[PDB]
Structure 1
Amino acid sequence: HAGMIIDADYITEDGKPIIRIFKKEKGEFKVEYDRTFRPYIYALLKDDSAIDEVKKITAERHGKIVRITEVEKVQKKFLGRPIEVWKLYLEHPQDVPAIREKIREHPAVVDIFEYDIPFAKRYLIDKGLTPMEGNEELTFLAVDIETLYHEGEEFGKGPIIMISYADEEGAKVITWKSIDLPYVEVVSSEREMIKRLVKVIREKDPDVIITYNGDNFAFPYLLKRAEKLGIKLPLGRDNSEPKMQRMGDSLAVEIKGRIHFDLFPVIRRTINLPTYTLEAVYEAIFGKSKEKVYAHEIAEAWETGKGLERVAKYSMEDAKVTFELGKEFFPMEAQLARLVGQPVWDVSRSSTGNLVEWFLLRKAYERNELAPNKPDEREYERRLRESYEGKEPEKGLWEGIVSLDFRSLYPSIIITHNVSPDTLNRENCKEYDVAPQVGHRFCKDFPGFIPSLLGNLLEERQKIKKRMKESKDPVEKKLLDYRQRAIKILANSYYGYYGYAKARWYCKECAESVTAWGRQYIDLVRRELESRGFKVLYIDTDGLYATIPGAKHEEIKEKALKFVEYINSKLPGLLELEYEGFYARGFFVTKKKYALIDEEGKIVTRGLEIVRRDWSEIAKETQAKVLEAILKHGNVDEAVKIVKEVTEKLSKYEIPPEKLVIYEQITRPLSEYKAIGPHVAVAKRLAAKGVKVKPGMVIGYIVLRGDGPISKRAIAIEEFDPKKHKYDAEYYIENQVLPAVERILRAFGYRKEDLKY
């Protein structure tokens, strides 16, 4: 029709699938239904006569037998070669996992294809439907909750004590205790507060619900408490409840007819932070501080009734900034959805590797190219163990560091050298390009599937950039700016995608060859930098860090900016080097393990910081102190003295026991564990005392002095008696503090043995 597609799914009616297309048409919510789309897979047979045995294969599901409804002989392309496969139709999507292995096992079946694409995604591709097209303006609502938590409680034990929401009308708090603030609505109970949230959402009818970690906290918690209280959450536009989907080891929540936009996975990919707390995230984007009110402060205020205004202000600000961040990060996710042709819900929760794959599956359909299969476990494992043919960084502390980015070099290399799995070492090829050093041959006789698509993306970006220069409308310009950035992101992900172990179009030789050709330009950049007095401190496939030893910082910045402008004038086509940034100081340990500090004093690290609950505070605190001594004080000698003093204090039992607590979650019933770690040993004793130990409960423990593995010497933090129990100083030194700092201090020539008296 005319509207913007925001999502798609399927429902089953009288055992048959119905596709639903969720649309927004000039401000109105619309649902279109399609009963005609049929599930299918492909089968390559040894011979056409075999179809008579294959079409008769059956399976079982929902107490009924599953059959192939129709078969169709089709002509397609596989690896740039014509192929004849049989399209096997099935009645219901759930018939595909039930029958696919019974077809694959058949002696007449060479292989099966396209048997794991979800029905709603299969529909959008086959029908040529693209989400988020048009100038349709969506409505947004941020949602958040505060709860009553005590250390180690089962998930959902304590009530929800506040629910906050925010949009352009302001930020509001719903609570069931008397708090006298203008934005606070006081209700009678937890039940009445949850029913008020339901009413707000049904009345405001937002297209987008913005949360911060709503997938794994706010919505699973609301669902747990609504279950306990025996109330429904009809938040879906079809009155359905929020739906929890197991996405990996964690969860993802969907709200039918809407976009549940969880900012946590989105921001985690976009920017680099040691910890992605809402307060750290808000400050990195808006340059303003946000106060954190910790779980224990919240519990204390609720139970004593004192200082509840502070907790209500915290709840309000949580919703307020969640709204602000949502508006900031949504436009780019909307353009990426449009580009890849899949809904924002899915696109915002996926890696760039999956964004590339979704883009390629759609283009394969458009081009009548059969998609290769995802690897089996053994192949995936064989791919992770593959070695690539074709430096370690400078030691010590460096000053005035410029960062240069190479990533925009690789799409142009893929295109000019026709680097694709369908062009690699092709038989009876008339002309080919040979990769330097690795010698892989890529046929020049026809454009490769992936170079062809990249060429079109880069051309489309150049058109957008030209239309941007010629536009007087700042609205169109803002939108076109997002569109051209989406292409840059997608195009710059192909190099990585070639080496991604889960990729359908995985190609080790393609990745290797792009690296080998890329290196010729990197070596040119390095020689040209050194001829200009620059010293290269660190270099990898993504970029480099350099300085002019002992030069004035403004001179380094000017010379680097002049260098980038010069080299890009020398580089042919769309090969581009970028000036990324400047740092006051920094040091480099190894590949993607380094730490820097900018001119505003913000520490920036990669592959070193250990901010996680399963590491003791003493190890995390010492590591922070070491990085601060090095980057803020330019003093490695102070850092070594900090480690030496901490280790002596641990040996003389001068460290508070509270800085020694280790936290680990129970993730299954205790009887299901194959290996009993210290937290499981502690948990089993707690359950033996009558504690209801459940998956989700976090176990706090201290390692005590003694013989054997740490499993037999861990004690529950609640059972620790400082007057009776002695902590293991050698464990906290050798397994906690020293591993936290040894990688960092290796960059300065220190070994683990030199960090003690």
Structure 2
Amino acid sequence: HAGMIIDADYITEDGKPIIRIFKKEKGEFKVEYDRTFRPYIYALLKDDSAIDEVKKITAERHGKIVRITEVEKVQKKFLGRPIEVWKLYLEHPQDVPAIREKIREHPAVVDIFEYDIPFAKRYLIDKGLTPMEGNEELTFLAVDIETLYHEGEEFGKGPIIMISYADEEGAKVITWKSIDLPYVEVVSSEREMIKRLVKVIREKDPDVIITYNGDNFAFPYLLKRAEKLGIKLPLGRDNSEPKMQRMGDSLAVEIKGRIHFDLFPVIRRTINLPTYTLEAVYEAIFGKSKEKVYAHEIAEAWETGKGLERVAKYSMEDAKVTFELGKEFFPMEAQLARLVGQPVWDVSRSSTGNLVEWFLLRKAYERNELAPNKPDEREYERRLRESYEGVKEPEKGLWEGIVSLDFRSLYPSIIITHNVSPDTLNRENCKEYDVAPQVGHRFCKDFPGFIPSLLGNLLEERQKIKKRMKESKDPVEKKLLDYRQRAIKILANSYYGYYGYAKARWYCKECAESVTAWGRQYIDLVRRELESRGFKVLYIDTDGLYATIPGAKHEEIKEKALKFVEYINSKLPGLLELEYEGFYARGFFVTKKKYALIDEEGKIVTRGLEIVRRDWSEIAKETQAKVLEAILKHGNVDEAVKIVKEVTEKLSKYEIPPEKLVIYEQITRPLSEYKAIGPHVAVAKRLAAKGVKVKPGMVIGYIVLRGDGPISKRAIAIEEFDPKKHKYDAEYYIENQVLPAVERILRAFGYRKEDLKY
């Protein structure tokens, strides 16, 4: 029909699957049901006669036997060649994992294909359905919670003490203690506060629920407390509860009929930050400071009843900026969903590698191209161990007035012009081919490759959008078209990386190597042209470079660099484009994707160096921050080396507060399941021995004490530490904490680990 598709899933009714398509039609929520779409896989057989044995293969599920309902001989393409496979139909999606191994094991079966595509994704592809089409306006609600937390408690032990939400009508706080603020609704209990959140969500009926780390905190915490309090959370538009899906080592939460938009994985991909706290994220995007009120300050205010107005304001600002950030980041995710043809829920939680793959699976269907399979563990491992031939060590020391150049828009044009594809690689009986420089891989020119063909269409579509943008008087159309052309740029600039992605179906080591080798000819041209203009290249990798004019005035460097980019792009043919990325007052480079810079507004920017994580001591993270600050803010490496030397001496003379030595590590499974007992497990087992209910999710704080052997046998629980009796291991905090934190940084200045002590 007419509506915008926002999501799709399936339900089972009388044992049979039913697809649900969630739509928004002129402001109204609509669900379309489809009972007719059938699950399937493909099987390549050694001979057609074999189908008679194969169609009779069975399996078991839900106490019932699983059978192949129908078989169909089909003509498709595999690796740019016609092939005949058998389409095997199944009644239920859950029949596919139950029977697939029993088909694959059969001696007459060469291989099986497309056996791990989720039903809802299979449906959108096969039916040619695209989410997020049209000008349909969605509604948004940001949600956040504050809880009572004490160090090392099991997840969900303390109550939720506040629930905040925000939309265009304002930011509000729901709490069960008396706070006199205009945006605070006081209720009688935690139970009544959670039921109030349920009522707000059911009444506001948002299409999109925005959270900041809601997948792994707000919603698992709400579900834990609702379970304890024996109450339901009917937040789904079908009155279903939020659903926790194990997505890797972490969680993802869905709300049926809506889009649960968690900003945390979204922003982590979009921008570069050493730490993605909401306060650091808000400041990077809106250029305004946001105060952080820490867990201990919140617990103290709740328990004493003093300073609750500050905690309520913190809760309110958390929802207010979550709404603001959601409106900022949602349009690009909506266009990416549309482009790749999968819902925002899925697209916002995936890498660019998986965005490419879903775009390719859809295009393979449209072109009757059988998809290759994801690799098994051994293949994936063999791919990670593959060595690529044919990006030097960066210049040492501290440089001033650094311009950053980006090469990424070069590679789609290389893939297309040289027909770089796994289906064109080293083709037999090829009349014409392109030979990659240095590496010598041959790509057949006789037919367009599957991936070059698609990229060519993407680039052409982006140029049409850019042309329609120049000719548009409507600023609403322009804004939308700007997002659409940026979505293409993002997807197209991900193919180069996708070729080398070990999990990729269309993985091609020789394709990735060849793109690099052809790419290098232009990079070498950019580098020679920069050096002829007095520029010194400080750092270069496949994504870009950093350069300066040694000792030149900063405005002269900026002007010359901007003039250079305009010049080289006038020389480069086709859609090959170099981009001026930015300018930095100072910076230094350690190795590949290990560097630190500082811009003219004094903001430090690093890659592959900062260690802001709870399993490193504060003394190591504080010393590291001080070293970066001495180098970038003071331009003084000598001050940085003196900071390390002073810290190490203070550690040796037991002059460092024990609180700066605490290491935190989470328990992730029952204690009896550990194969290797690390210091936090050794500490945990002693706590459980004393009667402490140790559970997965509990974070263990410990200090390493002086003594013989592995650190596991010398770690003490932070609560058991007695400064009068226990002596911390100075050698451990020096050699395993402080020195590894700074040694990579100071190696860029010619210092070895042994020169950072008195």
TM-score, length of structure 2 as denominator length: 1.00
How far the C-alpha of 1:431 sits from its partner, in A, is 0.2
Task: Write out per-residue CA displacement over residues 182-228 of structure 1, whole angstroms, 9 at most, x where no aligned residue.
Answer: 00000000000000000000000000000000000000000000000
Task: Write out per-residue CA displacement over residues 584-639 of structure 1, whole angstroms, 9 at most, x where no aligned residue.
Answer: 00000000000000000000000000000000000000000000000000000000
How far the C-alpha of 1:726 sits from its partner, in A, is 0.1
How far the C-alpha of 1:502 sits from its partner, in A, is 0.2
How far the C-alpha of 1:656 sits from its partner, in A, is 0.1
Tell me, what secondary structure is at the counterpart of 2:468?
helix
Measured in 1, the distance between the counterparts of 2:442 and 2:632 equals: 47
Tell me, what secondary structure is at the counterpart of 1:217?
helix
Task: Write out per-residue CA displacement over residues 502-530 of structure 1, whole angstroms, 9 at most, x where no aligned residue.
Answer: 00000000000000000000000000000
How far the C-alpha of 1:360 sits from its partner, in A, is 0.1
Task: Write out per-residue CA displacement over residues 323-351 of structure 1, whole angstroms, 9 at most, x where no aligned residue.
Answer: 00000000000000000000000000000
- Paired residue for 1:42? 42
How far the C-alpha of 1:356 sits from its partner, in A, is 0.1
Tell me, what secondary structure is at the counterpart of 2:476?
helix
How far the C-alpha of 1:118 sits from its partner, in A, is 0.0
Measured in 2, the distance between the counterparts of 1:317 and 1:535 equals: 46
Tell me, what secondary structure is at the counterpart of 2:241?
coil
Tell me, what secondary structure is at the counterpart of 1:609?
coil
Measured in 2, the distance between the counterparts of 1:526 and 1:314 equals: 50
How far the C-alpha of 1:106 sits from its partner, in A, is 0.2
Tell me, what secondary structure is at the counterpart of 1:648?
helix
Measured in 2, the distance between the counterparts of 1:462 and 1:91 equals: 44
How far the C-alpha of 1:276 sits from its partner, in A, is 0.2
Task: Write out per-residue CA displacement over residues 539-564 of structure 1, whole angstroms, 9 at most, x where no aligned residue.
Answer: 00000000000000000000000000
Measured in 2, the distance between the counterparts of 1:283 and 1:436 equals: 46
Task: Write out per-residue CA displacement over residues 673-708 of structure 1, whole angstroms, 9 at most, x where no aligned residue.
Answer: 000000000000000000000000000000000000
How far the C-alpha of 1:722 sits from its partner, in A, is 0.1
How far the C-alpha of 1:420 sits from its partner, in A, is 0.2
Measured in 1, the distance between the counterparts of 2:381 and 2:25 equals: 47
How far the C-alpha of 1:169 sits from its partner, in A, is 0.2
How far the C-alpha of 1:357 sits from its partner, in A, is 0.1
Task: Write out per-residue CA displacement over residues 298-344 of structure 1, whole angstroms, 9 at most, x where no aligned residue.
Answer: 00000000000000000000000000000000000000000000000
Measured in 1, the distance between the counterparts of 2:503 and 2:302 equals: 48
Measured in 1, the distance between the counterparts of 2:170 and 2:558 equals: 43
Tell me, what secondary structure is at the counterpart of 1:298?
helix
Query: Residues 534-573 of structure 1 correspond to what in structure 2 (within 5 A)?
Result: 534-573=535-574
Measured in 2, the distance between the counterparts of 1:425 and 1:544 equals: 32
Measured in 2, the distance between the counterparts of 1:14 and 1:549 equals: 75
Measured in 2, the distance between the counterparts of 1:160 and 1:566 equals: 59
Tell me, what secondary structure is at the counterpart of 1:215?
helix
Task: Write out per-residue CA displacement over residues 269-288 of structure 1, whole angstroms, 9 at most, x where no aligned residue.
Answer: 00000000000000000000
How far the C-alpha of 1:175 sits from its partner, in A, is 0.2
Tell me, what secondary structure is at the counterpart of 1:143?
strand
- Paired residue for 1:22? 22
Measured in 2, the distance between the counterparts of 1:69 and 1:600 equals: 66
Measured in 2, the distance between the counterparts of 1:286 and 1:120 equals: 37
How far the C-alpha of 1:109 sits from its partner, in A, is 0.1
Tell me, what secondary structure is at the counterpart of 1:723?
coil
Tell me, what secondary structure is at the counterpart of 1:180?
coil
Tell me, what secondary structure is at the counterpart of 1:219?
helix
Task: Write out per-residue CA displacement over residues 350-375 of structure 1, whole angstroms, 9 at most, x where no aligned residue.
Answer: 00000000000000000000000000
How far the C-alpha of 1:69 sits from its partner, in A, is 0.3
How far the C-alpha of 1:108 sits from its partner, in A, is 0.1
Identical positions, percent: 100
Measured in 2, the distance between the counterparts of 1:574 and 1:535 equals: 27
Q: Mind listing any 5+ residue stretches in structure 2 that lack a counterpart?
A: none
How far the C-alpha of 1:75 sits from its partner, in A, is 0.1
Measured in 2, the distance between the counterparts of 1:322 and 1:350 equals: 20
- Paired residue for 1:66? 66
Measured in 1, the distance between the counterparts of 2:177 and 2:540 equals: 57
- Paired residue for 1:443? 444
How far the C-alpha of 1:713 sits from its partner, in A, is 0.0
How far the C-alpha of 1:728 sits from its partner, in A, is 0.0
Tell me, what secondary structure is at the counterpart of 1:612?
coil
How far the C-alpha of 1:654 sits from its partner, in A, is 0.1
Task: Write out per-residue CA displacement over residues 709-745 of structure 1, whole angstroms, 9 at most, x where no aligned residue.
Answer: 0000000000000000000000000000000000000
How far the C-alpha of 1:658 sits from its partner, in A, is 0.1
- Paired residue for 2:322? 322
Measured in 2, the distance between the counterparts of 1:701 and 1:170 equals: 43
- Paired residue for 1:220? 220
How far the C-alpha of 1:397 sits from its partner, in A, is 0.2
- Paired residue for 1:602? 603
- Poorly superposed stretches of 4+, deviation over 2 Å: none
Measured in 2, the distance between the counterparts of 1:566 and 1:275 equals: 37
Measured in 1, the distance between the counterparts of 2:672 and 2:529 equals: 63
Tell me, what secondary structure is at the counterpart of 1:476?
helix
Task: Write out per-residue CA displacement over residues 254-281 of structure 1, whole angstroms, 9 at most, x where no aligned residue.
Answer: 0000000000000000000000000000
Tell me, what secondary structure is at the counterpart of 1:216?
helix
Measured in 2, the distance between the counterparts of 1:537 and 1:115 equals: 48
Measured in 2, the distance between the counterparts of 1:220 and 1:142 equals: 16
How far the C-alpha of 1:492 sits from its partner, in A, is 0.1
Measured in 2, the distance between the counterparts of 1:632 and 1:296 equals: 31
Measured in 2, the distance between the counterparts of 1:561 and 1:311 equals: 47
Tell me, what secondary structure is at the counterpart of 1:587?
strand
Query: Residues 639-650 of structure 1 correspond to what in structure 2 (within 5 A)?
Result: 639-650=640-651
How far the C-alpha of 1:387 sits from its partner, in A, is 0.3
Measured in 1, the distance between the counterparts of 2:264 and 2:10 equals: 27
Tell me, what secondary structure is at the counterpart of 1:595?
strand
CA RMSD of aligned residues (A): 0.2
Measured in 2, the distance between the counterparts of 1:376 and 1:273 equals: 34
Measured in 2, the distance between the counterparts of 1:543 and 1:187 equals: 55
How far the C-alpha of 1:172 sits from its partner, in A, is 0.2
Query: Residues 243-258 of structure 1 correspond to what in structure 2 (within 5 A)?
Result: 243-258=243-258
Measured in 2, the distance between the counterparts of 1:738 and 1:459 equals: 52
Measured in 2, the distance between the counterparts of 1:615 and 1:642 equals: 18
Task: Write out per-residue CA displacement over residues 430-462 of structure 1, whole angstroms, 9 at most, x where no aligned residue.
Answer: 000000000000000000000000000000000
How far the C-alpha of 1:18 sits from its partner, in A, is 0.1
Query: Residues 124-143 of structure 1 correspond to what in structure 2 (within 5 A)?
Result: 124-143=124-143
Tell me, what secondary structure is at the counterpart of 2:215?
coil
Tell me, what secondary structure is at the counterpart of 1:659?
helix
Measured in 2, the distance between the counterparts of 1:200 and 1:334 equals: 25
Tell me, what secondary structure is at the counterpart of 2:700?
strand
